[PDB]
């Protein structure tokens, strides 16, 4: 583990070093954010250097027409006055900071941020051609600047800004197999239409096919005209006013009919992927650093509302059922079931690539 990230303020005066950009949320514990900030050979003109980690919601404004314009609203802000060091604030260095100081000297001032564990992971919302500026959604950013006080108007070239991601990965143990079932009883009889469905497993990885086992016991006189299977991304978004959407990210419409007094068992296989979802502006993706492709967003995991973008997935299985009968076409006969599952990356061994690694 011999390389570290660095970025300098445009005027060289300030430089930020970090051991990584992705800090894993393991539900009860988040990797702390530790690096050093290097103040230059009296390129420095300001009287104090702080570092701040901000979790922010980034959005554009629909009412306006300024391409590239976005606004960042803070959800969590922390600061350190690391230059000059403040007494009554003694802290012990990480091993990373200890190495960095040996490499650089006493003018490398450390900073450590422990992240509150109840905060949203980095999520980006799918842009459309119109969206030309920065990626909307939820992002972390470490900021280093040199100023008189925390009230000072911060020159942009006196500062450095680095995007960092807060990410989760798949759990070791899979949950119970996802099974569901529903019974519809109709008006003049008691012989039901029964829908049983199940997924082959509870945790899936991005790009991995999802096998949906469908068991229809149609004891009725109605006919199942089609069977619709869809994978749906659910997004629960909270920024004082909440919002919510469910977006089909993969979908098969089988013209598989179930006769009256019939059973029907068929496996369906769907694979969520982004390529056939590019039209869907606002679809939730794993957080971007600048503009590289990311995958459909992984499932948010939570301890047993909360701000940011909570993502989750369900298979839906819907029987489209013929009408007629006593009520003509006025009442739906349809039958549906929903199968929750987890969609995530496996825990890696090395920190995942910053950019498109074949670029």
């Amino acid at each position: 583990g011999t390389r570290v990230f660095k970025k300098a303020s445009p005027n060289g005066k300030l430089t930020v070093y970090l051991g990584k950009r992705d800090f894993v949320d393991h539900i009860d514990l988040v990797e702390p954010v530790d690096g050093v900030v290097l103040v230059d050979p009296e390129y420095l003109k300001e009287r104090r250097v702080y570092v701040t980690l901000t979790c922010a919601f980034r959005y554009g404004r629909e009412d306006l027409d300024v391409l590239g314009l976005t606004f960042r609203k803070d959800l969590f802000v922390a600061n350190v006055q690391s230059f000059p060091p403040a007494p009554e604030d003694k802290k012990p260095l990480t091993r990373l900071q200890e190495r960095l100081i040996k490499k650089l000297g006493e003018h490398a001032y450390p900073f450590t941020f422990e992240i509150p564990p109840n905060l949203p992971c980095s999520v980006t919302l799918q842009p459309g051609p119109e969206d030309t500026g920065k990626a909307c959604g939820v992002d972390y950013e470490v900021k280093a600047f040199c100023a008189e006080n925390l009230e000072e108007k911060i020159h942009k070239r006196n500062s450095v800004r680095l995007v960092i991601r807060k990410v989760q990965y798949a759990p070791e143990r899979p949950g119970p197999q996802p099974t569901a079932e529903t019974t519809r009883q109709f008006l003049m009889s008691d012989k039901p239409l029964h829908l049983e469905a199940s997924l082959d497993k509870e945790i899936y990885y991005h790009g991995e096919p999802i096998s949906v086992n469908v068991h229809v016991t149609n004891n009725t006189n109605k006919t199942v005209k089609k069977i619709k299977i869809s994978v749906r991304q659910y997004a629960d978004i909270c920024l004082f006013n909440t919002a919510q959407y469910k977006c089909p990210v993969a979908m098969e419409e089988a013209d598989d009919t179930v006769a009256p007094s019939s059973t029907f068992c068929k496996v369906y296989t769907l694979t969520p992927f982004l390529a056939n979802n590019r039209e869907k502006r606002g679809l939730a993706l794993d957080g971007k650093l600048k503009h590289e492709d990311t995958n459909l967003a992984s499932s948010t995991l939570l301890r047993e509302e909360i701000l940011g973008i909570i993502v989750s997935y369900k298979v839906k299985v819907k029987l489209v059922v013929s009408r007629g009968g006593l009520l003509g076409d006025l009442a739906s006969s349809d039958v549906a079931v929903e199968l929750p599952f987890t969609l995530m990356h496996p825990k890696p061994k090395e920190e995942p690539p910053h950019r498109e690694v074949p670029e």
Partner: antibody, heavy 119, light 108 residues
Framework: VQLVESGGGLVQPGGSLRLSCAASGFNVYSSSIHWVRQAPGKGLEWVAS????????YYADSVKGRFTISADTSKNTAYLQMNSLRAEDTAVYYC?????????????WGQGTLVTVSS | DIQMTQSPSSLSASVGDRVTITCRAS??????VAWYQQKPGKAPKLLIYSASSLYSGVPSRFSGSRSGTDFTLTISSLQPEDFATYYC?????????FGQGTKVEIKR
């Protein structure tokens, strides 16, 4: 759990060929798929790649304009269709597999298919 | 593009010697380097990725290193098995590019 290439034989100069690479036992939307050619004893040359998860294809400037990488994900197979072939493109073409999340080298190679190009 | 020149390009040693192959990159490719072994008449196989990470199922004796734009593959003691040709690959920039090879033989 294997790659197997197909097609590939003798075709006159300026003609065309289509190779298929049948990917067995891994998920084509979680993997990228590449062709790599190795002339008779001269090292390794990347020629084209494709990401079905993201719908993007990439080429070496050597085969731009006359090679096309495609995928039929229903059949778990990829294709490299090769028209306007020179002697120079004579090689053992390899179908190699990559991990889509994320690229950590070509971790699996096909047994190769030979394509000679001469009159 | 990126040129990846493997230095030794051919070298002799005996079962149990400590060989090192090097590969210098045209420019900074970060750690996006893989190493590959290819036996004759047989398809290349993957040994090391990210410049330093051993691929699953590869003997511990194979090790990758990086020093800025310079990359080494060392084998700590040759076995009868691993007598082959070795290429390095950068994969930080389309077009990914290999090296010319380094043949290692028995030195009897």
């Amino acid at each position: 759990v294997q790659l197997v290439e197909s097609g590939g034989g003798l075709v006159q100069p300026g003609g065309s060929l289509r190779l298929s690479c049948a990917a067995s036992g891994f998920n084509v939307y979680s993997s990228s798929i590449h062709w790599v050619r190795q002339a008779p004893g001269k090292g390794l040359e990347w020629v084209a790649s494709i990401s079905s998860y993201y719908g993007y294809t990439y080429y070496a400037d050597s085969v731009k304009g006359r090679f096309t990488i495609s995928a039929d994900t229903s059949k778990n197979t990829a294709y490299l269709q090769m028209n306007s072939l020179r002697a120079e493109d004579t090689a053992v073409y390899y179908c190699a597999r990559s991990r889509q999340f994320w690229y950590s080298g070509l971790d699996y190679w096909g047994q190769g298919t030979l394509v000679t190009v001469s009159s | 593009d990126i040129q990846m020149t493997q230095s030794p390009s051919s070298l002799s040693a005996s079962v149990g010697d400590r060989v090192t192959i090097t590969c210098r990159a045209s420019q900074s490719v970060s750690s996006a380097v893989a190493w590959y072994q290819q036996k004759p008449g047989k398809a290349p196989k993957l040994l090391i990725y990210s410049a330093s990470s051993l691929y699953s199922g590869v003997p511990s004796r194979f090790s990758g290193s990086r020093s800025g734009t310079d990359f080494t593959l060392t084998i700590s003691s040759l076995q009868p098995e691993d007598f082959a040709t070795y290429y390095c690959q950068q994969y930080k920039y389309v077009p990914v590019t290999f090296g010319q090879g380094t043949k290692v033989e028995i030195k009897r």
